[PDB]
Structures are given as structure tokens and as C-alpha cells.
């Protein structure tokens, strides 16, 4: 349940920054492209967010949960789902940047849990990932 989409996304985001880590491919491609477009368009916002983010082992779980709860406070939509994935990427990149790479595995798990428990119903009820591909393809 959703581990693969998260794992392939985070692997890609980290690889884009020079770090090696470790349903169908059109979905993973579309998400990569959407995320990339989003981070390019909002490059300064993302750079400043990366900067200002507070991150340690003891605070990371609460930081992720709080951000993601606020992101979806008003409901789910695809643009917010893309931001979610991109924010998971930011946290993972910063984790590695700040010599806290042990957090990557945890962040990926939190992302998969959140998809499974909190985004799955909206995605299921709004045409699934195929709809995402139709919107962004």
C-alpha cells in the first residue's frame, strides 16, 4: 500500500541532488514531472522553506505531521498532493544535507502511512491516479 510510489519519488528527489538511496510507470513519471515543475516554479519559496525548516531526530516526526495536517486542512486536491510529495522530498534532501540521513527512511514511511490512511479515500473517490495522469499528462 503506497510504499512504491513514495519510494520511487524520494529516490528520484535525492538522486537529483547527487545522493543515492534505494502503480504503473506513467503515474511515477507524471508525478516526477509535476513535482519538478512545481519546485521550479516556486524555486525561491522552496529554497527559503528548506532553509527555515527545523529538523532533528526528535522533532522530525512532529514537523512532518504538522506541515502535512496544515497542507490538507481545507481538503485534498491533486495540487496539494503534489506539494505533499515535494515537501517529503525537501525534508529528505535537507536530512541528508544536514548529516541526518538516517531520517530519510522514516520520512518515506510517514509519507506512505499518510497516503494510505489520509489520502487514499480522496484519491479513490476522484478517479484514482489515472485521473492524475489525465490532469497532468
Amino acid at each position: 500500500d503506497n510504499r512504491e510510489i513514495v519510494m520511487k519519488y524520494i529516490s528520484y528527489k535525492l538522486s537529483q541532488r547527487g545522493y543515492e538511496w534505494d502503480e504503473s510507470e506513467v503515474v511515477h513519471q507524471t508525478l516526477r514531472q509535476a513535482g519538478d515543475d512545481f519546485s521550479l516554479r516556486y524555486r525561491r519559496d522552496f529554497a527559503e522553506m528548506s532553509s527555515q525548516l527545523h529538523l532533528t531526530p526528535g522533532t522530525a516526526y512532529a514537523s512532518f505531521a504538522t506541515v502535512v495536517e496544515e497542507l490538507f486542512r481545507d481538503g485534498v486536491n491533486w495540487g496539494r498532493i503534489v506539494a505533499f510529495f515535494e515537501f517529503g522530498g525537501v525534508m529528505c534532501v535537507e536530512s541528508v544535507n544536514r548529516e541526518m540521513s538516517v531520517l530519510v527512511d522514516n520520512i518515506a514511511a510517514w509519507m506512505a502511512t499518510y497516503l494510505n490512511d489520509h489520502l487514499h479515500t480522496w484519491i479513490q473517490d476522484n478517479g484514482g491516479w489515472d485521473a492524475f495522469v489525465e490532469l497532468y499528462g
Binding site: 512545481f38 516556486y42 522553506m49 527545523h54 504538522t66 506541515v67 496544515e70 495540487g79 496539494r80
Partner: peptide, 19 residues
């Protein structure tokens, strides 16, 4: 407290999404 900085990041992110 530390909730507050993270809450504001989340709002920034939501607003970027909705843009």
C-alpha cells in the same frame, strides 16, 4: 510553540499548491 513555525510552513505550502 515549534508547532507554530511548522504550521506556517504548511500554510505557505498550501498557498503555493493553490496558486
Amino acid at each position: 510553540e515549534e508547532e507554530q513555525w511548522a504550521r506556517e510552513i504548511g500554510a505557505q505550502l498550501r498557498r503555493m499548491a493553490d496558486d
